[PDB]
Design a protein around this ligand. Structure first.
Ligand SMILES: C[C@@]1(C(=O)O)N[C@H](C(=O)O)CS1
Ligand SMILES: N[C@@H](Cc1c[nH]c[nH+]1)C(=O)O
Ligand code: NA
Ligand code: NI
Length: 464
């Protein structure tokens, strides 16, 4: 039983602290997880307690081994977390840990002050546990506790995994897994249709009908918590508030949702899906080309002297470049000349902030039930996913207050305050809350398509 998977968004390093792919493909696990309904659960943890607000006491399960046969102990968890914190800003900024002590299966994690979201962020896949004493490169073949061990990695191309027979939860159902990267969603579907691959993610919405028609294949949709957007580069002085507001008004969100996503998305306002009951969304921006033209006039742009925008896009999320095309067309009516640059390695490209004005983008904005992760990583300076370097001290203050706020209703309140204040800045233009669409050979069973948009393979995934 060999499973062939095709994924977009090629990786360089596949250290767990560099990408969620090891968790996705069943190689690694974090201390906590979210379940099918998106709620935080103990995973590797047998018990935990929080005797005060600066102390987290954890007891690990006693029956868990890494794929090399080494026991999962508190010392191994300590060294893993500490290495990940040292090696990744994302991890570091999500885990304000002041000290860790360990003995046997118990560890104690301390902070300097109350950080209510610490436990939640220990379910983050970037915090997955690996063996720091493994005598192999963690960037190529990390050793985890998951059901499938990474055996070979051809960088940016292909990952080969094998059944870890002593996997703690159950004997995994597949013999091998082969993961190959393919950025073009139409190619991913062709690969599925030709049986080159068995399981693919991020199915282009215009191929959904074809896959539904095909009795050899099946489609799963899940509304979840991913948001597409137009992301602005705030380090470029020409990307003023008026320019951001103008572009916000050239977007037709209802049209994009109806016709580009073909109803597999809802028009977006804030970063966060409006399905979440406590979120107070800002008002929906409706396309207004005349308004955009007026906003650009404030900056001196005219038909004779238009604004020039370099807009980056990428194929991985198939609808993004379709949005870019209609943005380009409509923007011309508002005296903006957009040049679209499609790139193969989007994060590699955006690292050079001299090379772009704006980019199509996609965020997992609330993977573990709380808005804090997104605010800290996306809206704070040097936040790990803040590719356009948005920062506003007034927003910072509220985020900082949020981070120490224990009462949940008060967190919801401050969060809505952050949404309201930041929305005035147009940090990004959030376009759609769009479904994750996964497709597979009908023989492939028990993979995950759940709202957090991270998990896929577990020990029950199989071929029948
Ligand atoms: C910015 C981020 C995202 O899509 O939310 N990119 C990576 C991902 O898609 O997993 C890590 S988090
Ligand atoms: N954050 C973007 C780009 C990316 C590349 N790899 C992971 N993410 C997305 O999820 O589409
Ligand atoms: Na990224
Ligand atoms: Ni991403």
């Amino acid at each position: 039983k060999d499973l062939n998977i095709s994924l977009p968004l090629k990786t360089k390093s596949i250290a767990p602290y560099e990408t969620d792919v090891p968790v996705k493909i069943g190689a690694a696990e974090s201390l906590f997880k979210t379940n099918d309904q998106g709620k935080i659960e103990k995973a590797l943890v047998k018990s935990y307690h929080q005797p005060n607000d600066t102390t987290l006491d954890i007891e690990l399960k006693d029956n868990i081994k890494f794929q090399n046969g080494q026991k999962l102990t508190a010392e191994k968890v300590k060294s893993s977390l500490e290495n990940s914190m040292k090696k990744s800003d994302l991890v570091k900024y999500s885990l304000p840990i002041s000290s860790i002590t360990a003995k046997g299966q118990k560890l104690t994690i301390k902070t300097n002050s109350a950080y209510p979201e610490l436990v939640s962020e220990l379910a983050n896949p970037f915090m997955a546990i690996y063996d720091t004493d493994a005598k192999s490169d963690v960037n190529q073949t990390p050793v985890g506790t998951g059901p499938y061990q990474i055996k070979d990695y051809k960088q940016s191309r292909k990952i080969s995994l094998s059944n870890f027979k002593d996997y703690w939860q159950g004997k995994p159902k597949l013999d091998h897994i082969t993961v190959t990267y393919q950025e073009d969603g139409n190619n991913r579907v062709r690969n599925l249709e030709s049986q080159k691959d068995d399981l693919i993610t991020d199915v282009p919405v215009n191929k959904v009908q074809d896959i539904e028609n095909n009795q050899n294949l099946k489609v799963s949709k899940e509304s979840g918590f991913r948001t597409s957007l137009l992301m602005y580069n705030h380090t470029n002085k020409k990307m003023t508030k008026s320019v951001r507001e103008a572009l916000d008004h050239i977007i037709d969100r209802q049209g994009i949702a109806d016709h580009i996503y073909q109803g597999y998305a809802k028009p977006a306002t804030s970063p966060f899906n409006d399905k979440i009951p406590y979120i107070k969304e800002p008002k929906l921006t409706k396309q207004n080309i005349e308004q955009a033209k007026m906003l650009l006039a404030k900056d001196g742009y005219t038909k004779e002297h238009p604004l020039k925008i370099k807009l980056i896009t990428y194929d991985g999320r198939p609808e993004l470049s379709k949005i870019a095309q209609v943005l380009q067309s409509d923007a011309k009516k508002a005296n903006i000349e957009i040049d679209i640059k499609s790139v193969d390695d989007i994060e590699g490209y955006l690292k050079d902030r001299s090379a772009w004005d704006a980019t199509m983008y996609s965020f997992g904005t609330i993977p573990r039930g709380d808005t804090g992760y997104f605010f800290n990583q996306a809206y704070k300076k040097d936040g790990a996913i803040n590719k356009g370097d948005y920062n506003n001290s007034n927003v910072d203050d509220l985020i900082n207050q949020l981070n120490h706020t224990v009462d949940v209703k008060e967190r919801h309140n401050i969060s809505n305050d952050i949404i309201k204040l930041s929305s005035r800045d147009v940090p990004n233009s959030y376009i759609a809350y769009n479904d994750q669409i996964v497709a597979a050979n009908s023989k492939v069973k028990n993979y995950k398509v759940t709202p957090e948009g991270i998990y896929l393979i577990d020990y029950r995934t199989t071929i029948e």
